[model samples]
Target chain A: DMQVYIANLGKYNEGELVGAWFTFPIDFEEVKEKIGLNDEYEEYAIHDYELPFTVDEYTSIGELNRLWEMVSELPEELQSELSALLTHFSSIEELSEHQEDIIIHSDCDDMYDVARYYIEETGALGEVPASLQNYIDYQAYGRDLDLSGTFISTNHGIFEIV
Target chain B: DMQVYIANLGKYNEGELVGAWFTFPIDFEEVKEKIGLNDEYEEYAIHDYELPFTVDEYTSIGELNRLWEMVSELPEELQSELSALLTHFSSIEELSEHQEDIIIHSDCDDMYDVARYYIEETGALGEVPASLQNYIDYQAYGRDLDLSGTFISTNHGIFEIVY
Candidate 1:
């Protein structure tokens, strides 16, 4: 339930704060109309926002709208992880363009969790007896994943090195 | 002749403006002493500057001092050219480290000037009779230089491609 207050910079320069709020996954045309923007008042700035990540006045409305639409359709847990990783790109457009290659490893506390998840997902671990499961050295397995190189571990998750 | 006014951020927070002006090619230790910074008050910001390039509060004092020192030692005309090119680097330290490879084709108005200077420097054009020099297709020669590879042309110069 994120909202952004986009203000028209042209009107703000004329000493009037003319704008409107819009929810995430915005209908940009609706915002353009409701914010009271005409052809002469096309330039706008994100005056304020309520979201997990930070964005400056330079954030592109078209790109952000597209990015939020993509994120809003993603798994709920992965949405926040992707938001935190957005800063790696200069614009949301770059992130969206490169989305095909980006592999998000979410809900990982450490490399051990990453290894555990990868092994289960890929079926790297064959059916082991329940008694033998505790004997598997996940810490050492995680070290091997680290040695594979260049996975960027973030606070909430890890990103595959681009 | 350029001067920068570095204000102590700590002092400014305390409702006092404490700082001093220093010329470029600055002795950073002298700036620290004259600006009245101490062990307890080490943080500072560039309040103002009279330089060809813009710098922000995040600009490193040591890096800028080193950069200006290098610039002050270059040929007078090339100094401003190099200053304009500095923004391509995030820090002056990055530029200084790559200086050995940064071929500054100074005073060039176009690829034509670069072609002319490069040919002249490399002696690619042997001593042609004064009259025959006019027959040399320098315009095409300059076009050839452009097609040769990736060269970044600027307002005053070109940069050789790193690869």
Candidate 2:
């Protein structure tokens, strides 16, 4: 049995209470405004909100170090290109925490839907082929958060986040 | 009427000029040092050197701008990925200057050899593949100097010479 309602200050859904939450507000305009949507573009927008969790608690440092070792094993050119990105573990950790908070705070029912909203609102999903979206959806629902191979190559590249 | 030499620089043959007025000595060791492969990895050794030459003058900014516009027309994600690289025009200019020097310095009899050497050393013969050798070749030949299609997608993004 599942019940859904609008909550002002508490976990909007029971999954949130269980440490997994999702939400999508009813008024698209209000949601857009709260999320900082551009008036000219009718597309969904992301708000400049801070994460609800701490960086250190998202994942173990051991896991991150192991991932770094794996990346180092790639081709020499790839290693050279990815060197700066590999060193930015602190920022990656913070991002992971923020993503976890979004999952916890969202009101959407399906995690894939929530992920799509996040991706679209941030414009990260633009230009992605449908096949890739299917692949992402498959991983989101079928795979464990830690076991997903999709993230292995996605996050480890030469880009700095400020 | 033209002669050139192509030798394996690292994993691919790079082109070089022979009997050209400004031809430089083959410094395989210097290249090895640049890639950090000095005695570290023998499998991917650079055993050849070639000098490329062309009678053509250096490529102009107009040509580079055309390439830049083409790159900009790609998908937004691709544009985002390539923005910084596509904007790197000085590197492109340096490449063009190097090729021009190779051409201007080459004796007429050695021009073909220089082109062959350029083709082999820079690995500029085929579609670009994902390898350090390919990247080096693209940098050496296909950049602003060569302007070949195969060299365009060799790296994460596009680069052009500004000056």
Candidate 3:
């Protein structure tokens, strides 16, 4: 079996989530304190979730590489538009070592769940159909290092990325 | 058993090394013509090898990532010093789509192996301990796409890489 624990590779379970990051004795409250999350997401966060998880199931390297090239090819304005999505993406390093985890801390001005934030912030929110299983992930600097951005994906294409 | 065939993730098997790529009906011929090779490497090339293969023993991502980060930090000129190493590296696209293959047609250019052509040209052949088993791979551009640089490791640090 693979020894799965990693540092900054960002693996965590719910127990770790509550006893750690948020209030250190609480759950989900940090999200509420920062982003004004409602019961929908609050409950979601309270349940099974992980930060830097792929919004899309990992598939072929070609597809992943294609998306990688597309993002790199974007023009400046579009690149700026995708700033959050780009930042929220997991590096191969993070994805290669993924487990399960959650939450984000904000510095006032409301907190942002980078993956969800990217979806809602991007123009594609309306494009997401009802009852569709959503795909989201967190992005930060150094790729594997953050709670800064979020991404949403579905179908073969990324519906929206922040 | 986990059949570990992977591309761009940079896995390889020596058997695959002999069975794929070269004479699988031809490419990278320019390198063969330009670099003067003696019979030893030329015969080595005539064997089988694939760009991306499922390495025999699966290893740790931790050690691999540490090596990746190290190479990425090299200065540009020093990086250029490793062109041969750079060219030998494959991308995720190249590897993912890779089947077994080989043939860089080599020989006694001091008996340089294609992989070694890189280290020596970059002035790292000697720096690499002769007995050290080399672990090398291509660096990614879009997570796994590589047409960019190469990487080799004996310990945790990288030797060189570039555009």
Candidate 4:
């Protein structure tokens, strides 16, 4: 038989990080083989799918917006790239209406950027510019990405402030 | 006096990786300490400036364009985002005419997706959907971002594919 497990991570979720729980019959033994979720790690059970918009992500975007004047800082091309995206957003309400999705989907190996303050390396964050060097590294069972000249074991979710 | 370097990574630059070297008076040590190439590391030197066009970056972008079907995969909002940038170009001749710029710069910490093949990760690439597992993470890099998930990285640099 396939047993099931469920829990909530709301208290622990922070910044670009998020948490949730789902419970369903999932499976019936049917004279069959089944797996268990007795393990305690969050990454183990939760899929890395893109999360819908939330107040925390919204808050982080808003905070970064005020502190960093981030746009003027990009090179001409990327700034042009961004200015292009801004065309969709005529006002703040549009972003609130449109929302955003995660770059990394749960249990998948994809790359996306999250702000620095969200990571364990809090001390590394200073200016919100592309120049802020403090970064945090996390591990996932099988995903790989390279940034910061860091080691692969150090790769998983990165702590870039960009 | 100080020095700068340049090379075409053809032999050394593998896959989409690229290399370039420059030599000029650039600065005389009469140069302000503010421009410190001596900051001591290669990572220290490449801020997010765009790498000059290379067969490699071009090759990566082209492969991703065909594989991911990326422009179509983007949400309508980002599709519009991409469509907006396209207003700048009308034909292959224009890009050849308008040209592009280098990939990194100082004081620019932001995110824009590029082919994972463009940076250090040399392998592990496949179809180009929003769901594909391989991604190259850029540091100091999203809005729900004009920079984050959009695929100007794989774009034909045009609008037909999206709308």
Instruction: Choose the strongest candidate by lDDT.
Output: 1
Write candidate 3's Cα lDDT for A24-105 as tens digits: 1223444444434455433222222133224332232234344455544544333333434334444534322331221222
Best by TM-score: 1
- B1-163 per-residue lDDT for model 1 (tens digits): 6778888766654467787887866676886787677854378888888876667766667767866876666544446565555656555456556655667676776777766665455545443333223333456667776798656666656775454
Docking class of 3: incorrect
On TM-score, who's better, 1 or 4? 1
Clashes of each: 0, 39, 29, 32
- A23-110, model 4: which lDDT tens digit per residue? 2222223102222222332222232222211123222222323322343343333232332334444433443333342122212223
DockQ of all candidate complexes: 0.00, 0.01, 0.01, 0.01
TM-score for chain A of every candidate model? 0.54, 0.19, 0.19, 0.15
The 0-to-1 C-alpha lDDT of every candidate, in the order given, reads: 0.66, 0.32, 0.30, 0.29
State residue A132's C-alpha deviation in candidate 2, in Å: 17
Candidate ranking under lDDT, highest first, comes to 1, 2, 3, 4
Instruction: Please provide, for model 4 over B48-158, each residue's C-alpha lDDT reduced to its tens digit, 9 standing for 90 to 100.
Output: 222221123223222323322433444443333433435444532333333332122122233323232322232222222332232223332222224433323323332
The parts of candidate 1 lying over 4 Å away from their true place are A1-162, B12-16, B24-35, B87-91, B102-110, B113-134, B150-163
* Candidate 3, residue A80: lDDT: 34
Instruction: Point out where model 3 deviates above 4 Å.
Output: A1-162, B1-147
Per-residue alpha-carbon lDDT of candidate 3 for residues B1-163, written as tens digits (9 for 90 to 100): 1112112222235534322322212333422343333333242222222322222223322323333344344434323333333345553224222212322222312212433444434433234323122222211111222134334332222333333
TM-score of chain A of 2: 0.19
